[PDB]
Design a protein around this nucleic acid. Structure first.
Ligand SMILES: [Ca+2]
Length: 223
DNA sequence: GAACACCACACAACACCCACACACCAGGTGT
DNA sequence: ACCTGGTGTGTGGGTGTTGTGTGGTGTTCAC
């Protein structure tokens, strides 16, 4: 083991203010390790998180793409506000938005009608299966790429792929109907609905070292 | 009543965890 | 020509194990 000097501590902080988006990463602290000999990505990251995060004070403002802003006179801008990190959490409002969107697509496909309307004649206005009562049941697609592109176009918080993998690994897991039924129920019971969690079923990949462990056992960059 | 070595832990250092956001691809079906 | 299941990957937010920087406790020293 090796002790952290104030020289190193203040150098960790100067990297983080210069790479704000990466504050919660593992790779960023693995990058500093290459500049502070005797210290690992793990140690550097725990050190920041535990004893140094509280001394952030300011960060430098960056762009969306997502480093780094300068004024007209080529100087850095000190900011007291964090920019988005790399990954965005899924919310209950987002999970419900997607369910409804898919329950709507599924409705548009199965009946060729589209709510809150009629047809996309005949045939008695209001006869339309509709909609609140319509249950997706066993249905899991087809969904064109058009869907998740348009959906992410309208709802920017998450990307096309981000959205599809939620629908895939979470929505289809819990059930399109079950989440609509759940979310609406919590609201009814004056409770605040929670995004669905703990549904990551993936077959065992032994081998493939645990991620988020940048140790002295590489480290060892040789670059 | 300063001064000098030996033995604790407690806390600091560094390891390791894992579910999932966001990602890209092959194979089947489609055509 | 495209839906869709298989699966890489490292983030976000922790937690587990372990080596060491001071302090606390106790003997072979001038005054
Ligand atoms: Ca009608």
């Amino acid at each position: 083991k090796a002790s952290f000097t104030d020289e190193e501590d203040e150098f960790i902080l100067d990297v983080v203010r210069k790479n704000p988006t990466r504050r919660t990463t593992h790779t960023l602290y693995d990058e500093i390790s290459h500049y502070v000999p005797n210290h690992t990505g793990n140690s550097i990251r725990h050190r920041f998180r535990v004893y140094l995060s509280k001394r952030l004070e300011y960060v430098y403002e960056v762009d969306k793409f997502g480093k780094l802003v300068r004024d007209d006179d080529g100087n850095l801008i000190k900011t007291k506000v964090l920019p988005p990190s790399i990954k965005r959490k899924f919310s209950a409002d987002e999970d419900y938005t997607l369910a409804i969107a898919v329950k709507k697509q599924f409705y548009r496909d199965l009946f060729q009608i589209d709510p809150d309307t009629g047809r996309s004649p005949n045939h008695v206005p209001g006869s339309e299966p509709n909609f609140a009562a319509y249950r997706t049941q066993s249905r899991r697609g087809p969904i064109a790429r058009e869907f998740f592109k348009h959906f992410a176009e309208e709802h920017a918080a998450h990307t096309e792929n981000a959205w599809r993998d939620r629908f895939r690994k979470f929505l289809l897991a819990y059930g399109i109907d079950d989440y609509i039924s759940y979310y609406e129920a919590e609201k009814a019971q004056n409770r605040e609905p929670e995004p669905m969690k703990n549904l990551t079923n993936r077959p065992k990949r032994p081998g493939v070292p645990t991620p988020g462990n940048y140790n002295s056992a590489a480290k060892r960059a040789r670059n």
